[PDB]
Each structure stands twice: as structure tokens, then as C-alpha cells.
Amino acid sequence: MSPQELQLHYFKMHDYDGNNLLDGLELSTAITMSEDELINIIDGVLRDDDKNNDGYIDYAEFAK
Amino acid sequence: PHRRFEYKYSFKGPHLVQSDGTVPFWAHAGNAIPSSDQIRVAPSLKSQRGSVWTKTKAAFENWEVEVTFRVTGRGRIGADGLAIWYAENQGLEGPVFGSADLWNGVGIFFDSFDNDGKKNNPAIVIIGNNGQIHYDHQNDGASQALASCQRDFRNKPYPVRAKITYYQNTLTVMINNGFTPDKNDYEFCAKVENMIIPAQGHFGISAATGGLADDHDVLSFLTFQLTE
Numbered sequence: 001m002s003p004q005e006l007q008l009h010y011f012k013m014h015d016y017d018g019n020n021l022l023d024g025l026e027l028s029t030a031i032t033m034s035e036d037e038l039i040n041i042i043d044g045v046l047r048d049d050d051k052n053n054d055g056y057i058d059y060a061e062f063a064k
Numbered sequence: 065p066h067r068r069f070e071y072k073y074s075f076k077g078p079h080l081v082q083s084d085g086t087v088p089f090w091a092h093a094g095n096a097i098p099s100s101d102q103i104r105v106a107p108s109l110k111s112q113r114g115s116v117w118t119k120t121k122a123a124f125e126n127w128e129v130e131v132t133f134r135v136t137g138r139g140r141i142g143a144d145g146l147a148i149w150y151a152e153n154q155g156l157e158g159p160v161f162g163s164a165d166l167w168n169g170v171g172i173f174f175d176s177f178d179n180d181g182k183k184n185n186p187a188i189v190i191i192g193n194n195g196q197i198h199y200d201h202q203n204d205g206a207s208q209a210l211a212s213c214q215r216d217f218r219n220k221p222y223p224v225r226a227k228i229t230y231y232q233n234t235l236t237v238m239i240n241n242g243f244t245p246d247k248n249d250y251e252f253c254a255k256v257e258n259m260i261i262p263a264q265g266h267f268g269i270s271a272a273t274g275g276l277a278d279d280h281d282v283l284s285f286l287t288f289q290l291t292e
């Protein structure tokens with residue numbers, strides 16, 4: 001397995017509903033601290049990486 | 065209309081609760097018991113009340129919630145039902161399907177038990193309120209209902225799904241009656257045109273039982289902001 005495949009495996013490992021998108025609740029679990037700091041991290045990830053603003057990070061958005 | 069999923073006003077399994085037993089971003093109260101795959105909002109014990117409400121208010125011009133639930137009981141008759149909420153204040157405990165009375169906003173009541181004996185249950189009722197009206201429990205809110213449908217949402221082979229849409233000042237309730245696992249088999253239930261509701265509000269879900277008691281399980285509450 002390549003690194004990129006290892007990254008894909010993490011993406012898929014937190015895609016519990018199998019829709020090939022990671023939402024904020026799925027992202028939260030990946031962060032296995034207060035609810036306010038958690039909100040700020042997740043909002044941060046969405047702000048920076050959710051390019052189409054649908055509330056999901058798809059694999060393309062995940063890869064960069 | 066563009067949809068944006070809103071994680072802060074949502075919950076679902078398979079990791080629905082944190083290690084301390086709480087639902088991230090939501091408060092729960094009364095007899096509601098969250099577990100990693102669902103929240104048993106009100107179990108099939110006598111006189112139960114439970115609720116789950118968002119910690120913060122949502123400020124969306126248009127929105128859509130998808131709630132997946134199951135209301136299960138021994139009898140062909142069960143009680144009392146479940147409520148989906150958008151309201152100014154958190155109604156964590158109270159006599160209205162487990163939540164506070166005198167709410168400001170809208171309740172969508174999935175009422176199992178025919179308190180007035182009109183043989184018109186289970187029923188889905190949409191009741192707006194401005195902070196002053198006492199829910200008419202004994203008449204299943206019939207005089208307070210802006211709209212309603214008859215729909216047996218109990219004891220179904222698959223989880224029932226309700227889609228509640230607030231778009232361009234119309235509130236629409238679509239119901240997937242749980243006869244199949246196809247998530248998108250929604251049928252129209254009821255709608256209110258020209259409805260105006262607080263600009264900001266908590267989302268919530270609650271349930272209760274009485275002498276008769278169903279289990280009221282909610283598997284997921286998923287909120288989307290709609291733009292256009």
C-alpha cells in the first residue's frame with residue numbers, strides 16, 4: 001500500500017454512511033477537550049477545505 | 065436550491081454519543097437515553113418524558129431537517145407520540161410530548177394516541193405558537209393545528225423518515241412510511257403557506273408516554289440550510 005492509499009483508507013474509515021463524503025460529525029470522530037474547541041477545529045476544516053460549501057469534504061477536497 | 069449540511073444541528077450513529085454519554089452539540093433531558101446508534105427519547109415505561117435540543121440557535125432563512133425514527137409498541141394502540149421542534153427557547157422539559165408548553169415557533173407532532181376519541185390517529189399535526197398558547201393535549205391539538213394528516217407511523221418494518229422543509233415561507237412535511245428501506249420513498253403529508261417563524265431558533269425532538277407507552281427511538285436528526 002502507497003501513502004495515498006493509506007490516506008484514502010482513513011477517508012473511507014470515517015465515512016460511516018458510505019456516501020463518499022465526510023461531514024462534520026464524521027470529522028469529529030476522527031478527532032477520536034471542550035465542545036467549543038471542537039466546533040472551532042471542524043469549522044476550520046470546513047472553511048479551509050470545503051471549496052463548494054456543501055458542508056461535506058469529498059475525496060478531491062480531502063486530497064487538496 | 066443549494067443544500068448545505070449543518071453538522072452543529074445534527075446527530076446520528078454509529079458514534080452518536082461521546083465517551084461521557086453526551087450527544088455532541090445537543091442537550092438531552094428527562095428519560096431520553098442516548099446510545100451510540102440512537103436515542104431512546106422515551107422508553108415504553110409509564111409516564112415518560114424526554115427530549116433532545118440543540119445547544120445553540122440556528123439562523124437560517126430556509127432549512128430542511130431529516131429525522132429517522134421508530135415508534136414501536138405491543139399494541140395496535142400506543143401513546144403518546146413524538147415531536148419535532150423549531151423554537152426560540154429550548155423546551156427541554158414539559159407536558160408537551162416531553163417538552164415545554166408555550167413555545168414560540170413550530171411543533172410537528174406525531175400523535176399516536178386519540179385523546180379525543182375521534183378515531184383519527186395516528187396523526188401528524190403542525191402547530192405554530194407565539195409563546196402564549198397552551199397545547200390542547202386532550203383534543204390532540206385539533207383546534208390549534210394549521211395543517212395535519214393521518215399517517216400510521218408506528219410498528220413499521222423499517223425506520224420511518226420525516227422530512228420537514230422551511231423554504232420561502234412555506235413549511236412542508238413529507239413522510240417516508242417505513243414500508244421499504246429506500247430512503248427516498250417520501251409521500252406528502254401537510255404544508256403551511258405564508259408561515260413566519262422566529263428568525264433564530266433551537267431545533268429539538270421530544271417524546272412522552274402515559275398509561276400506554278411505546279418506545280420512541282430517533283436514529284438521526286440531520287439539518288440542511290437551503291439557499292435560493
Ligand SMILES: [Ca+2]
Pocket residue numbers: 014015016017018019020021022023026
Ligand atoms: Ca459520509
Ligand SMILES: [Ca+2]
Pocket residue numbers: 050051052053054055056057058061
Ligand atoms: Ca464540499
Ligand SMILES: [Ca+2]
Pocket residue numbers: 144175176177178179201204
Ligand atoms: Ca394525543
Ligand SMILES: [Ca+2]
Pocket residue numbers: 177178179180181182183184185203204
Ligand atoms: Ca384524535
Ligand SMILES: [Cl-]
Pocket residue numbers: 016025026029076077078079080
Ligand atoms: Cl457518528
